[PDB]
Write a protein that binds this DNA or RNA. Structure first.
Ligand code: DTP
Ligand code: CA
Ligand code: K
Length: 430
DNA sequence: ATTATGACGCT
DNA sequence: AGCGTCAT
């Protein structure tokens, strides 16, 4: 009891831009605003591949990884915006730059960890302490939480969505004011007030809307964020965990959506995260390893200690192109021309990164896929990255991969290559 | 022919 | 070092 950790020491948020690439395109082109629309890359094969979908289009069943020609069958009036193509490949610069806009705003409020192009974790513990000092015992008004859901509420003894949201918020605040909750619950509530302010600043200063989760750790904040999308935020308290986890499929928890989660389900014969509480820590470690077992034991009780890392910039800068089916690269000249295209994009991005961020990459990683191999990468080799020069990088990448060509004819490449990837890594200050 | 990324773990 | 997993 009095010595059992409860993982309530931090306030962590996860902010996730709504349908991010779509919003970037809708800001630029007002004709796309408030419409079913999607972002596509390429166009020739089946209309292009959809990579982002507005909520209006999701209502018709349009999803990521769908061909645009197929999405048009579900939604004939679907509008499309195409990712820019440069040097023969998709170029994501517009979205990376829009991401920097949002990350820089978030950084004014607290330390952030860039989790993805449109996702960041926020460690709000210190900001919450400061705001509590400012509040000076003053109650928190529902007006400060206009887009917040309290997971699990309302409960106990309105048929519209917003009505339910307000009922749950009122129950939560009523119990905080009466002193029937805990200090961690108050800390989370102040965290949610700050996240409302952060999200309002993002929308004011960029036009972009987002969703957010507020809880005591990264996994719960991530889970919380997805509960009420789009343009809403969700507070998951420690006390909400048993009910929330009691019907939560294991695959919904970050890191458990793949083979490990499937093995947890199969080996233990369970379905929901809460069912993990019935195993000892040693049992879980025996099946899933020391690290995973301790993580699962704490996580199923709502406890996780992974820190929000102070990192706003990506740690690698990479450029990749697939060459599917009949387009697989089958001559040496083809391989060299495409390595050059990739290296030219990489050089441009690296030179900009060095000027903006006072750092230089020192390692070049070259990865390829051969036709027939089921794995995304068939081979990875590294070499020194000593000059930001596209011809040198493309020649070096060729040097490190040239021995993979089985073909007895030097001019021919076999087996054909279905993917090329260049990645700059190992940054040092400059 | 579900593409272009990006972080992190294992040995 | 090179490979594998998980995720957006
Ligand atoms: N598999 C992918 N391939 C290519 N681009 C992707 C992929 N997944 C995500 N992206 C890009 C497009 C998305 O706009 C952006 C953020 O991804 P993600 O958060 O999963 O979805 P989303 O922002 O489009 O919608 P949501 O509102 O559900 O968050 O990253
Ligand atoms: Ca998103
Ligand atoms: K995201």
């Amino acid at each position: 009891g009095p010595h059992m950790a409860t993982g309530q020491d931090r306030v962590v948020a996860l902010v996730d831009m709504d349908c991010f690439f779509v919003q970037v395109e809708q800001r630029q082109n007002p004709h796309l605003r408030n419409k079913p629309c999607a972002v596509v890359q390429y166009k020739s094969w089946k209309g292009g591949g959809i990579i982002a979908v507005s909520y209006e289009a999701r209502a018709f069943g349009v999803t990521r990884s769908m061909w645009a020609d197929d999405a048009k069958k579900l939604c004939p009036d679907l509008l499309l915006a195409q990712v820019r193509e440069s040097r023969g490949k998709a170029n994501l610069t517009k979205y990376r730059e829009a991401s920097v806009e949002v990350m820089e705003i978030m950084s004014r409020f607290a330390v952030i960890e860039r989790a993805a192009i449109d996702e960041a974790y926020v460690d709000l513990t210190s900001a919450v302490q400061e705001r509590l000092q400012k509040l000076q015992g003053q109650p928190i008004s529902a007006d400060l939480l206009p887009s917040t859901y309290i997971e699990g509420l309302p409960q106990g003894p309105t048929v519209q969505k917003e009505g339910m949201r307000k009922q749950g918020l009122f129950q939560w605040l009523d119990s905080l004011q009466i002193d029937n909750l805990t200090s961690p619950d108050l800390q989370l509530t102040v965290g949610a007030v700050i996240v409302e302010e952060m999200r309002a600043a993002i929308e004011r200063e960029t036009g972009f809307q987002c969703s957010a989760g507020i809880s005591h750790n990264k996994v719960l904040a991530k889970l919380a964020c997805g509960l009420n999308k789009p343009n809403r935020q969700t507070l998951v308290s420690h006390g909400s965990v048993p009910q929330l986890f009691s019907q939560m499929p294991i695959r919904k928890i970050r890191s458990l959506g793949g083979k490990l989660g499937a093995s947890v389900i199969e080996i233990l014969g369970i379905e929901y995260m809460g069912e993990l509480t019935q195993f000892t820590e040693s049992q879980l470690q025996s099946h899933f390893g020391e690290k995973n077992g301790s993580w699962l034991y704490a996580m199923c009780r709502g406890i996780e200690h992974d820190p929000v890392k102070p990192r706003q910039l990506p740690k690698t800068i990479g450029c990749s192109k697939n060459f599917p089916g009949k387009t697989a690269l089958a001559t040496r000249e083809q391989v060299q021309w495409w390595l050059l295209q990739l290296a030219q994009e990489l050089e441009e991005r690296l030179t900009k990164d060095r000027n903006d961020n006072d750092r230089v990459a020192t390692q070049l990683v070259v990865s390829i896929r051969v036709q027939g191999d089921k794995r995304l990468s068939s081979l990875r080799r590294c070499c020194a990255l000593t000059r930001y020069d596209a011809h040198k990088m493309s020649h070096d990448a060729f040097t490190v991969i040239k021995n993979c060509n089985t073909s007895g004819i030097q001019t021919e490449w076999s087996p054909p290559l279905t993917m090329l990837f260049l990645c700059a890594t190992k940054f040092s200050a400059s």
